[PDB]
């Protein structure tokens, strides 16, 4: 059993998951002076079908918005990829205070939250479960969220949280295109990395947007208002779910810009 508290947190994870001290761990600090511009990086092409939106679920440490992933209605293309990747999910990470909460940092700068839009390699693999542990199995768009103005595009997501307040609760969440949450510029960093929580597989090609999106201090409070406990128990708010940045270990972060 793992979490983000004292006993079961990021510093304890290695005890059950030795890959935590691996060579391709995420998130990282992106140092802009150390990034290598790569001229082969194509533009990011996302093409998502609103009808693939399926369900929202309170997973105890976080919440997920899952998508139907049986066909190629919702796909990521371009960037560092030859393979088309299929959308299956988006979720957020946040912190105890506005001062932190993002997973990735840029030149030491911590943002207030981070949006992850995750995809799996359906050109190569037959399922998420197969893809999940493969070097080229996963592609995740990471978007830094900067505290400021309320983000109207977050609304439907925020409004759905009242129906999944406690652990294990789930509800339909339909007719939503998560490319509406993405920044208007898709300029990006890319590097080979991992899932940022157990099982911490080194299967993720990260796409980190240069441009941030907004979130208000109140919108952040709604995330932290979600409960980690099951219905009927003592209310335990999901205060934070961000992993500390990890050693780059010789990896190079490429820039598309
Ligand atoms: C393949 O995923 C998984 C496979 C098996 C068990 C848990 C997860 N993972 C999860 O519950 N969240 C999750 C986390 C990220 S992340 N934060 O690294 O971008 C990306 C996609 C994910 O679905
Ligand atoms: Zn994530």
Nearest atom in ligand 1 to 131's CA? 1
How many structural domains is the chain composed of? Answer: 1
Q: How far is CA 29 from CA 18, 66, 134, in A?
A: 21, 28, 24
Nearest atom in ligand 1 to 89's CA? 23
Ligand 1 in contact with 144 (CB < 6 A)? Answer: no
Whether 60 contacts 227, CB under 8 Å: no
Count CA atoms within 13 Å of residue 157 on its CB side: 25
Closest residue by Cα to atom 3, ligand 1, is 132
Catalytic residue status for 37: no
Q: Which backbone phi and psi does 174 adopt, to 5 degrees?
A: -125, 165
Count CA atoms within 13 Å of residue 245 on its CB side: 18
State the CB neighbour count (10 A cutoff) for residue 193: 26
When computed from its CA atoms, the radius of gyration of the chain, rounded to whole angstroms, is: 17
Ligand 1 in contact with 158 (CB < 6 A)? Answer: no
Structure-determination technique: X-ray
Ligand 1 in contact with 132 (CB < 6 A)? Answer: yes
- Could you give the CA distance from residue 222 to residue 225 in angstroms, rounded to a whole number? 5
Q: Which backbone phi and psi does 173 adopt, to 5 degrees?
A: -145, 100
Nearest atom in ligand 1 to 196's CA? 18
What is the Å distance from ligand 2's center to 116 Cα? 5
What is the Å distance from ligand 1's center to 195 Cα? 6
Closest by CA to 99, choosing from 10, 217, 11, is: 217
- Could you give the CA distance from residue 152 to residue 75 in angstroms, rounded to a whole number? 24
- Could you give the CA distance from residue 117 to residue 139 in angstroms, rounded to a whole number? 8
Whether 240 contacts 96, CB under 8 Å: yes
- Could you give the CA distance from residue 31 to residue 248 in angstroms, rounded to a whole number? 10
Give the structural domain span for 247. 1-257
CATH, residue 151? 3.10.200.10
Q: Tell whether residue 37 is among the known ligand binding residues.
A: no
């Amino acid at each position: 059993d793992w979490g983000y508290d004292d006993k079961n947190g990021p510093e304890q994870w290695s005890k059950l998951y030795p890959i935590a001290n691996g060579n391709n761990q995420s998130p990282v600090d992106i140092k802009t002076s150390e990034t290598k511009h790569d001229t082969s990086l194509k533009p990011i092409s996302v093409s998502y079908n609103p009808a693939t939106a399926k369900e929202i679920i309170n997973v105890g440490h976080s919440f997920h918005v899952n998508f139907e992933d049986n066909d190629n209605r919702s796909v990521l293309k371009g960037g560092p990829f030859s393979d088309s990747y299929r959308l299956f999910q988006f979720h957020f990470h946040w912190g105890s205070t506005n001062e932190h909460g993002s997973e990735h940092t840029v030149d030491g700068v911590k943002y207030s939250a981070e949006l992850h839009v995750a995809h799996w390699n359906s050109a190569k693999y037959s399922s998420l479960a197969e893809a999940a542990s493969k070097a080229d199995g996963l592609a995740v768009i990471g978007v830094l969220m900067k505290v400021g103005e309320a983000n109207p595009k977050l609304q439907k997501v925020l409004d759905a949280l009242q129906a999944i307040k406690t652990k294990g609760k789930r509800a339909p969440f339909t007719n939503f295109d998560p490319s509406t949450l993405l920044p208007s510029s898709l300029d990006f960093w890319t590097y080979p990395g991992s899932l940022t929580h157990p099982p911490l597989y080194e299967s993720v090609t990260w796409i980190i947007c240069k441009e941030s999106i907004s979130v208000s201090s109140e919108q952040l409070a709604q995330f932290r208002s979600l409960l980690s406990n099951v219905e009927g128990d003592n209310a335990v708010p999901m205060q934070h779910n961000n992993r500390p940045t990890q050693p780059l270990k010789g990896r190079t972060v490429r820039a598309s810009f």
